[PDB]
């Protein structure tokens, strides 16, 4: 007894810390930069949609104005 405390504690004392650091690094890398880039891409597409909407609205208002 009291000799399995080493073999159940020291293991996770380093392996768990290193593995969680690895998980945090990979999750941040996968998540944050890709999300910001994708949001910028969607913003550019949204601006293009806004331009298309403005053009169509203006041309239809020009024709229909009677």
């Amino acid at each position: 007894d009291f000799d399995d405390i080493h073999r159940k504690r020291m293991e996770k004392d380093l392996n768990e810390l290193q593995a969680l650091i690895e998980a945090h690094f990979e999750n941040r890398k996968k998540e944050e930069e890709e999300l910001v880039s994708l949001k910028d891409r969607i913003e550019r597409r949204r601006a293009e949609r806004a331009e298309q909407q403005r053009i169509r609205n203006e041309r239809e208002k020009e024709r229909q104005n009677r």
Partner: protein, 371 residues
């Protein structure tokens, strides 16, 4: 085959196969019948949602715990909980697995006998064994001595053990536990305007207690500080909005543990029943018990309790002895980890209550040599 280490508890049922690190399925032990009428046809509405399913439909249920203070008050509901645990959370038929239940100290005999009778007749297990909830928590710490304070959610008990020889005359069982703290918190929240009454809102108050409350190192200084500054007021968002702000209710709810006069209980706090439990022991093993005080159970997870308790005991104890409080990070599942370790032992493999033995002596076999 492998053994099933179930642990009924009172508030959270923890179960899993023997030999692992953590319980496989942990879910509240509540059985809630619906209370309204119900107009949709064919919706597939059941008559009783148990376990973690009734913590999601709790808006239209009346949850009721089947275990009040360690003892079991509603046997049909407890049978339903066990059936759910075996068949849906573990999906292993009990006909092929030994079981290791756990029971608080100083409980009524009839409860234990009915438990074994159910396990042998309804579920028809091969062999079951009942163990005291504190010896397991001592197993999990890897010690062999020490006095363990297992403050669960139903009942707080304090079993001292030396060199493997338990001291039956020094067990101090006190019935203040997490549930009474939930009720007291729900009662002092009314001083700001928030009223929780329904049995469903008791769960919300429990969540508030878990996430916000903490044990003060010194009570009077905290009461004075919270009454002048506002650095303590932490806010919390209800399940529908309308955030609430908890002031000095934060450290007044768990203070009831050290002053049970708050909820009208006469007895002394958990800081003084441990010292009394030690002083009943012999004069030559008091140093070891002082040095190996073990904490377990859910309710001992309050942030800052391992320092308050040490300060209190150091105040009570003689100045020469060293007071050390073992507070492992895996406190909540300490009893179940110990249960897994005990069930995995080879020396223990012949202590099970085999079914043929029960057939020969009846349910009263549990009080006999097979304890």
């Amino acid at each position: 085959t492998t053994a099933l280490v179930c642990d009924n508890g009172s508030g959270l049922v923890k179960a899993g196969f023997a030999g692992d690190d953590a319980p496989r399925a942990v879910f509240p032990s509540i059985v809630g019948r619906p209370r309204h009428q119900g107009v949709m046809v064919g919706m597939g509405q059941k008559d009783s949602y148990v376990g973690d399913e009734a913590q999601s439909k709790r808006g239209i249920l009346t949850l009721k715990y089947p275990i009040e203070h360690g003892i079991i008050t509603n046997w049909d509901d407890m049978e339903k909980i066990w059936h759910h645990t075996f068949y849906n959370e573990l999906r292993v038929a009990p006909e092929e697995h030994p079981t290791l239940l756990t029971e608080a100290p100083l409980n009524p005999k009839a409860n234990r006998e009915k438990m074994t009778q159910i396990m042998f007749e309804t579920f028809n297990v091969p062999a079951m064994y009942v163990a005291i909830q504190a010896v397991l928590s001592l197993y999990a710490s890897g010690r062999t001595t020490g006095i363990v304070l297992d403050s669960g959610d139903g009942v707080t008990h304090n079993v001292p053990i030396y060199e493997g020889y338990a001291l039956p005359h020094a067990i101090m069982r006190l019935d203040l536990a997490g549930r009474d703290l939930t009720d007291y918190l729900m009662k002092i929240l009314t001083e700001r305007g928030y009223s929780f009454v329904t049995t469903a809102e008791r769960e919300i108050v429990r969540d508030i207690k878990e996430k916000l409350c903490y044990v003060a190192l010194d009570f009077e200084n905290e009461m004075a500080t919270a009454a002048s500054s506002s650095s303590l007021e932490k806010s919390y968002e209800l399940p529908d909005g309308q955030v609430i702000t908890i002031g000095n209710e934060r450290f007044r709810c768990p203070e009831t543990l050290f002053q049970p006069s708050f909820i009208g209980m006469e007895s002394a706090g958990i800081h003084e029943t441990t010292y009394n439990s030690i002083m009943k022991c012999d004069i030559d093993i008091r140093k070891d018990l002082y040095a190996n005080n073990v904490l377990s159970g859910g309710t001992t997870m309050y942030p800052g309790i391992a320092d308050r308790m040490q300060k209190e005991i150091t105040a009570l104890a003689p100045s020469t002895m060293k007071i050390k409080i073992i507070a492992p990070p895996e406190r909540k599942y300490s009893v179940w980890i110990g249960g897994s370790i005990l069930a995995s032992l080879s020396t223990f493999q012949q202590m099970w209550i085999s079914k043929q033995e029960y057939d020969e002596a009846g349910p009263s076999i549990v009080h006999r040599k097979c304890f």
